[PDB]
């Protein structure tokens, strides 16, 4: 639950990330897979990836970055009412990627760590509370489902 306030502060934050998706949705997942290496083995298609430089000089990572980032900014910009968005998502990381609800916390973190870092004094204190906020809002909605189907 955030406030119409919490919410301008994401969409605020998230013209940052619109205004380069592949760069912010590439360092999202490079934080990821190089964090929590057990997530790139959740993707046939980055496992080959054996070092960052291989993942950064990959074009289909930063494909895929702005695959997922632009889900996500569609689910962000329905400011909490995004159950068709979230829906098909849920169901496709539970039942095909079987991905934890761990690995969507991590990615959660990652975003954060992303924001800090591409926009270094850029992303107060009020922003990534709102900004985190808004992903543990995503992550539950997700978790719901995940209870749901019975995946863990
Ligand atoms: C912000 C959180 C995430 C969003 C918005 C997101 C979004 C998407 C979308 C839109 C797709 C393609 C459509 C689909 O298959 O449903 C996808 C595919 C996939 N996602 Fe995610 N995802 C997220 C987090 C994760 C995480 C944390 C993992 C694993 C650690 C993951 C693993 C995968 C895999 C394996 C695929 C299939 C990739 C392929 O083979 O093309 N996702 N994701």
Redo the contacts with the bound molecule.
């Keep these: 639950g955030l406030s119409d306030g919490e919410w301008q502060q994401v969409l605020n934050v998230w013209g940052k990330v619109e205004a380069d998706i592949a760069g912010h949705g590439q360092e999202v997942l490079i934080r990821?897979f190089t964090g929590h290496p057990e997530?790139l083995e959740?993707?046939?298609?980055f496992k080959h990836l054996k070092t960052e430089a291989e993942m950064k000089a990959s074009e289909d990572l930063k494909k895929?970055g702005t695959?997922?980032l632009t889900?996500?900014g569609g689910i962000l910009k329905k400011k909490g009412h995004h159950e068709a968005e979230l829906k098909?998502?849920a169901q496709?990381?539970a039942t095909?990627?079987k991905?934890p609800i761990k690995?969507?916390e991590?990615?959660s973190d990652a975003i954060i760590h992303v924001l800090h870092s591409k926009h270094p004094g850029d992303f107060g204190a009020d922003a990534q509370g709102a900004m985190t906020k808004a992903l543990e809002l995503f992550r539950n909605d997700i978790a719901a489902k995940y209870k749901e189907l019975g995946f863990q």
């Design positions: 990821l997530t959740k993707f046939d298609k895929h695959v997922v889900a996500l098909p998502l496709s990381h095909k990627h991905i690995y969507l991590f990615i």
